Amino acid sequence: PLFGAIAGFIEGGWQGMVDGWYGYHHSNEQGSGYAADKESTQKAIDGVTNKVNSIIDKMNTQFEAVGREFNNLERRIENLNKKMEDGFLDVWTYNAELLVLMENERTLDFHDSNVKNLYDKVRLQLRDNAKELGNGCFEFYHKCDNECMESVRNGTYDYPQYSEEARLKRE
Amino acid sequence: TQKAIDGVTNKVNSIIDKMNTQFEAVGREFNNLERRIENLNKKMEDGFLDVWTYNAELLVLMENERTLDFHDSNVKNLYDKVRLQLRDNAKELGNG
Amino acid sequence: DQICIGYHANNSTEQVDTIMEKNVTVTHAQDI
Ligand SMILES: *[C@@H]1O[C@H](CO)[C@@H](O)[C@H](O)[C@H]1NC(C)=O
Numbered sequence A: 001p002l003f004g005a006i007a008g009f010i011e012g013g014w015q016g017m018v019d020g021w022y023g024y025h026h027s028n029e030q031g032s033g034y035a036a037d038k039e040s041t042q043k044a045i046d047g048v049t050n051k052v053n054s055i056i057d058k059m060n061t062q063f064e065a066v067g068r069e070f071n072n073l074e075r076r077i078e079n080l081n082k083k084m085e086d087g088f089l090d091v092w093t094y095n096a097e098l099l100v101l102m103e104n105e106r107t108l109d110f111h112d113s114n115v116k117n118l119y120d121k122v123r124l125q126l127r128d129n130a131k132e133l134g135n136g137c138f139e140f141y142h143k144c145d146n147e148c149m150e151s152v153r154n155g156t157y158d159y160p161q162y163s164e165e166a167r168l169k170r171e
Numbered sequence B: 001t002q003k004a005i006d007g008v009t010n011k012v013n014s015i016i017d018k019m020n021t022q023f024e025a026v027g028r029e030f031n032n033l034e035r036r037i038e039n040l041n042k043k044m045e046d047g048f049l050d051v052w053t054y055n056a057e058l059l060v061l062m063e064n065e066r067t068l069d070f071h072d073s074n075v076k077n078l079y080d081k082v083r084l085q086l087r088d089n090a091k092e093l094g095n096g
Numbered sequence C: 001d002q003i004c005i006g007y008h009a010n011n012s013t014e015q016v017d018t019i020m021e022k023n024v025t026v027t028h029a030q031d032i
């Protein structure tokens, strides 16, 4: 202005970071950039376009109303035709609108679960070498520069490399 | 609780709103030499009633699972909110 | 040395509807 990340413990979005849908924001002594996590954004985009294309594909065989004419002594058949065409249009209108509603909530929950899964991926990598600040941040306990920033953003974070300074800094 | 009750009443109201334009069966009469068209009318009305019965029952089933999972996610998001703020000052006992 | 995780935004006024909430503002939406 289901999952608890988007509009959850992460309070709001980031206007500066425009490269992807989800990403990072590092703030060390060497600078402060707003990077984007690829292979999560691309997976989300692929899933979203696949979902949209399936919604287009499943609705190709709808009902097409044709014009049939009847005379004044064919009013029951005219009423039957009107009710058939209107009932099929109502059925497909309900199908389209209700499918839009469900897939909209599913898309929002999918984005939320993607953000929470990225959060959990970073949490499972840093382990105790960091500190969950509660808003989606991990204040590092050792000296972490760009070289370990890119490994956190990669998926190749090396836990045994950094454990001496964290214990000393704690009280 | 306020957000949860607003969500479930909104879900129920959208369930009522999407089903205003169902099929309404109208009585049409045919004679003994109009039996094919009588069968056509019977099959049309019964097929539309079956379609909307399936729509209502299946929508009730999905929205019932969604409501139960919504309450479950609300409880888990409250639990995770309290864990996040308490940090190491507390201790998870496992039961909540 | 923070490595905060978040998501993308604009100032867009694109609005969608879900089952439990209307007037949902979204970053990107596709009218169909
Ligand atoms: C991150 O991955 C890219 C792509 O494979 C690679 O070039 C880069 O060296 C990696 N960084 C680290 C710290 O391993």
Ligand SMILES: *[C@@H]1O[C@H](CO)[C@@H](O)[C@H](O)[C@H]1NC(C)=O
Pocket: C022, C023
């Ligand atoms: C939001 O949805 C409501 C229905 O609850 C509708 O009246 C309103 O026009 C929508 N908002 C906008 C800005 O169109």
Ligand SMILES: *[C@@H]1O[C@H](CO)[C@@H](O)[C@H](O)[C@H]1NC(C)=O
Pocket: C009, C010, C011, C012, C014, C027, C028, C029
């Ligand atoms: C917001 O998303 C819209 C589409 O709704 C897109 O045109 C735009 O690039 C994003 N950013 C801004 C600043 O509007």
